[PDB]
Amino acid sequence: DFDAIIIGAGFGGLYSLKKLRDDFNLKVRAFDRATEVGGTWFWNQYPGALSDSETHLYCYSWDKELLQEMEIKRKYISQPDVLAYLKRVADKHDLRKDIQFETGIRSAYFDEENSFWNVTTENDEKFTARFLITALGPLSSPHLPVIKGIETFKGELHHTSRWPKDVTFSGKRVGVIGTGSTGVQVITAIASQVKHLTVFQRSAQYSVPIGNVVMSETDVAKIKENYDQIWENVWNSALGYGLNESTLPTMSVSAEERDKIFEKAWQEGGGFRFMFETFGDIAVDETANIEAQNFIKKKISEIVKDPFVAKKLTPTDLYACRPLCDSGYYEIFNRDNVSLEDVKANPIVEIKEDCVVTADGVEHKLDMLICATGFDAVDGSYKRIDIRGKDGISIKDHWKDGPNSYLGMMVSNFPNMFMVFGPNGPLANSPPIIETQVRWIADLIGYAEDHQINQIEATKDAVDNWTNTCSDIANKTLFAKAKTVYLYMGGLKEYRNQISEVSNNNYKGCLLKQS
Ligand SMILES: Cc1cc2nc3c(=O)[nH]c(=O)nc-3n(C[C@H](O)[C@H](O)[C@H](O)COP(=O)(O)OP(=O)(O)OC[C@H]3O[C@@H](n4cnc5c(N)ncnc54)[C@H](O)[C@@H]3O)c2cc1C
Numbered sequence: 061d062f063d064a065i066i067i068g069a070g071f072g073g074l075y076s077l078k079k080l081r082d083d084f085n086l087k088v089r090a091f092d093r094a095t096e097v098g099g100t101w102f103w104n105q106y107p108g109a110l111s112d113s114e115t116h117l118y119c120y121s122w123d124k125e126l127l128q129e130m131e132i133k134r135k136y137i138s139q140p141d142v143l144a145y146l147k148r149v150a151d152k153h154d155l156r157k158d159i160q161f162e163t164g165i166r167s168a169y170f171d172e173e174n175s176f177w178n179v180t181t182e183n184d185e186k187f188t189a190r191f192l193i194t195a196l197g198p199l200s201s202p203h204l205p206v207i208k209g210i211e212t213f214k215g216e217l218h219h220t221s222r223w224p225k226d227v228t229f230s231g232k233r234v235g236v237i238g239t240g241s242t243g244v245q246v247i248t249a250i251a252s253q254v255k256h257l258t259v260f261q262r263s264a265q266y267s268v269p270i271g272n273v274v275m276s277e278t279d280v281a282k283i284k285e286n287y288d289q290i291w292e293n294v295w296n297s298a299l300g301y302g303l304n305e306s307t308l309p310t311m312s313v314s315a316e317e318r319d320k321i322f323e324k325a326w327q328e329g330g331g332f333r334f335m336f337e338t339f340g341d342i343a344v345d346e347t348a349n350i351e352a353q354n355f356i357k358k359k360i361s362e363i364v365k366d367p368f369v370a371k372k373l374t375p376t377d378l379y380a381c382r383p384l385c386d387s388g389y390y391e392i393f394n395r396d397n398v399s400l401e402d403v404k405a406n407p408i409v410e411i412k413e414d415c416v417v418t419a420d421g422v423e424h425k426l427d428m429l430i431c432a433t434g435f436d437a438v439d440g441s442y443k444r445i446d447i448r449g450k451d452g453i454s455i456k457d458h459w460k461d462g463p464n465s466y467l468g469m470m471v472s473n474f475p476n477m478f479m480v481f482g483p484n485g486p487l488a489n490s491p492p493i494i495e496t497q498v499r500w501i502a503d504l505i506g507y508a509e510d511h512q513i514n515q516i517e518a519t520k521d522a523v524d525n526w527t528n529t530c531s532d533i534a535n536k537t538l539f540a541k542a543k544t545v546y547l548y549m550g551g552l553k554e555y556r557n558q559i560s561e562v563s564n565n566n567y568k569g570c571l572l573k574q575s
Pocket residue numbers: 067068069070071072073091092093094098099100101104109110111112113114118163164165166195196197198199441445480481488489490491494
């Protein structure tokens with residue numbers, strides 16, 4: 061028996077555990093397949109893995125002593141250093157004693173008679189808990205490309221989410237399939253280390269400099285002396301990235317002033333910076349969006365000296381969705397040991413024991429093939445657990461057509477289950493989102509103990525109202541276009557307003573059952 065069972069020991073699960081156990085004095089246990097805390101920062105150890113947000117903001121804000129203790133080595137934070145940070149949090153707050161590692165959760169069945177959850181591990185251990193906290197993260201299973209013959213390759217073959225230790229590059233012919241955020245980081249990190257790199261690019265994306273530099277002790281002291289204001293700015297912002305979020309319309313300035321503004325963001329670095337600190341309508345107005353595209357295309361054409369390679373790297377679509385950042389990606393294609401293959405024009409048709417074959421018949425001989433090919437969507441982590449709520453309905457069936465929820469935290473037919481960083485949540489920096497949701501969920505659970513409520517559930521109507529709120533917001537944006545509604549796009553500040561109104565109005569939209 062527990063008051064709460066938590067699935068996941070990444071950012072979301074660790075704070076779920078600390079808040080429910082130490083601040084609300086509940087009996088809690090968390091579970092993770094991993095052998096150690098860290099979640100995605102434990103699993104993803106590929107070359108060049110790097111935070112998207114600056115080091116001093118990609119962290120918890122709720123422990124002020126930790127903030128002052130913060131190691132801030134570079135402007136952005138590498139995977140080993142995030143993993144080390146989350147280990148330090150677990151150390152300081154004595155968290156591991158209530159985490160069962162190497163334990164996958166196979167099923168969780170809601171017991172409507174007793175109003176609690178029966179949770180079964182993959183080793184057939186059964187646990188019961190009033191509440192179920194799912195902190196499963198944004199990504200499901202790794203997606204491997206479906207390519208004829210991929211199982212015949214005799215060299216090294218890895219998805220980036222299963223990067224083995226001890227990989228060496230010297231003397232090897234290496235291929236990378238995928239040029240999203242992960243592929244860009246891997247390619248930039250390994251091109252100088254391999255004998256030859258072939259990049260297999262299906263769709264060129266826009267990338268801006270991340271500007272990752274060492275942080276002086278003065279840089280760090282200024283941050284730490286001003287940390288309360290820094291966090292106040294996060295809670296008052298749409299993105300939580302520490303940006304000066306612009307309201308300036310792109311076309312309201314001259315051509316010369318617009319170039320200076322883009323160039324300032326480009327030199328400072330950061331994807332959200334380039335998209336949202338420059339001007340206020342890049343994601344909203346097509347004409348503004350085209351000015352942003354053209355600035356980046358001109359940078360590509362200046363960096364990449366061969367115009368035919370530059371052309372191949374140049375996208376043909378909107379500057380939209382989460383912005384990409386790099387530490388020297390376009391420069392890589394000037395190297396004599398790098399080949400770019402456009403596999404939209406020249407598709408991969410076969411993999412054999414020693415090569416990737418393209419449609420022109422060319423055998424690209426490889427010692428190593430890296431699949432930076434992405435992951436299944438967020439709801440897959442939910443559908444891969446056998447979660448059965450009211451009347452035995454499964455989340456596979458409930459979400460056949462995509463995820464829908466109330467506030468991103470509650471699913472109709474699934475009572476006493478609360479999602480952390482779940483679908484239909486905000487587009488912002490994740491740790492502020494997780495802290496916002498964990499604190500809301502925990503206050504609701506505390507309210508239920510105070511008012512002797514034993515079943516909490518969102519109504520179908522509140523879920524559908526949330527879906528409409530997200531749909532209305534997203535349809536004012538070019539993100540609705542470009543490459544159920546998966547995200548709420550109103551920003552962190554308005555998200556916190558939205559959920560505060562719900563808690564201030566006796567949890568409108570939630571069915572509360574007394575006993
Ligand atoms: C290189 C990289 C950089 C990033 N940078 C940023 C950034 O700057 N800003 C940002 O906002 N986001 C960023 N992200 C996104 C990142 O996912 C989030 O920031 C955050 O770490 C997610 O934490 P989480 O605890 O919610 O989920 P995760 O860290 O994914 O943890 C989920 C855990 O649940 C476990 N789990 C799932 N199903 C089961 C089951 N059935 N049984 C047991 N355990 C289970 C998994 O094993 C996993 O350990 C980045 C991601 C990567 C890979």
